[PDB]
């Protein structure tokens, strides 16, 4: 029933203020971070106990060397982009790559870049093409599309390797990644009722009020509690002149709290 995902994020900053990394890379399975690297440590490090226990030192030593390479490539690509835009000072380059494994077996994959936090280049692995936001991106896309070997490499990586990595990491983090922690839900009282849920995992939760759904409802965001679980809320105001109830849905289970 659960869709799982593996995602890598890459951040490059030119002229970073003293101490701040020029380059950072973090991987995630779902919301759980699994790996980190930056230009300050210059070391690939696990970010889950189940990654440290199942991947030997030689894995981290190899991945360190790969990330030293990706850090240099980022610096060079960002410096070229700044030239193409006659930009100086600090500018941002971002890369995001990932796949999803669905319950049924179907997969998705994605790869995109941003310059200064705006879409730059988006890969379509089905048409083996790149969408480019502007002439500078278009010029780069056209060189990438002239290299059929690299496109086919990326499609195979997204569809086969990323998914094999995800399946390997799901097995390693089985007990953490596949668990359900059902929410604790309470109601508290300006004469408003707050429906408050916490201790839940995974983060996906639906919360509402009824009496007939209430239309004018404030929603708290799903926020991380820090201990691997999440919290959220839905509030309503009471017309002083009517029997109200909180409805929560989580991982296939429905909960109702009737308020007297």
């Amino acid at each position, epitope marked *: 029933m659960r869709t799982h995902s593996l995602r890598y994020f890459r951040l490059g900053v030119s002229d970073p203020i003293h101490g701040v990394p020029e380059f950072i890379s973090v991987g995630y399975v779902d919301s759980h971070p699994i790996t980190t690297y930056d230009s300050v440590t210059r070391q690939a490090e696990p970010r889950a106990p189940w990654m440290a226990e199942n991947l030997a030192p030689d894995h981290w030593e190899r991945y360190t060397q790969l990330l030293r390479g990706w*850090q240099q490539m980022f610096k060079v690509e960002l410096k070229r982009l700044q030239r193409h835009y006659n930009h100086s000072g600090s500018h941002t380059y971002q890369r995001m790559i990932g796949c999803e494994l669905l319950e049924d077996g179907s997969t998705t994959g994605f790869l995109q870049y941003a310059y200064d936090g705006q879409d730059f280049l988006i890969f379509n692995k089905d048409t083996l093409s790149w969408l480019a936001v502007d002439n500078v991106a278009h010029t780069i896309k056209q060189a990438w599309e002239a290299n059929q070997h690299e496109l086919l*490499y990326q499609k195979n990586w997204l569809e086969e390797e990323c998914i094999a990595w995800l399946k390997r990491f799901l097995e390693y983090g089985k007990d953490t990644l596949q668990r359900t922690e059902p929410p604790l839900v309470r109601v508290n009282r300006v004469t408003a009722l707050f429906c408050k849920a916490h201790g839940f995992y995974p983060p996906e939760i639906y919360m509402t009020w009824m009496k007939e759904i209430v239309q004018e409802i404030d929603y708290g965001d799903i926020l991380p509690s820090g201990d691997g679980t999440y919290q959220a809320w839905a509030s309503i105001e009471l017309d002083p002149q009517n029997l109200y109830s909180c409805h929560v849905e989580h991982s296939g289970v429905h909960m109702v709290l009737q308020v007297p």
Partner: antibody
Amino acid sequence: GQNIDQPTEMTATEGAIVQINCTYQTSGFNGLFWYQQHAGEAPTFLSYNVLDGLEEKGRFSSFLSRSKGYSYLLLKELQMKDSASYLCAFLDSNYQLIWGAGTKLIIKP
Amino acid sequence: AGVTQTPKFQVLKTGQSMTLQCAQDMNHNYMYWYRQDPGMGLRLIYYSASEGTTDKGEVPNGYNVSRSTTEDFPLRLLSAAPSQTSVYFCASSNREYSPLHFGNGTRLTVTE
């Protein structure tokens, strides 16, 4: 990244065709390469396959079967200058380049 | 103009030190040293994923390298031994998955 095999030596007639086979075994794959090495010279890149199918370029073709773990290099209208070693190699999941022992192609006039 | 590797031939006495030079002006991030021995296939001695870093291959013992620049990846035999009699190939690649460009090789003999 476990194993790779290709014949030691092959012999074909000038003007004909030859197919050099390469088998590989690996849990993890990022593409298979063919390189040509003339005696007393450096290896030179010929081809890259990562999906199933057949790539063609002049007299040369490269085929890959992911399920069988199997590539071939096909050389058509063989010339004396095609006498060389042909090296297959494949990238594993960590980008280890694994080299076959090479196949020497002798072209008989 | 590709990968430049010098020298093309070298005789050394057991115990001598030697530096093989390798340069590429293609801005490739990856540089490699391999030795080639009859039957043995291509064995990786050392590689560099970028300037500022290096790492061992299959057979690093008796050898050293440095990567001060994108362009250059020197290979050092600190104490020439007869077992290092071989053909050495420097190579570069744009990325970890892209094709290798090879230098024209160093044929090295170590005699007593």
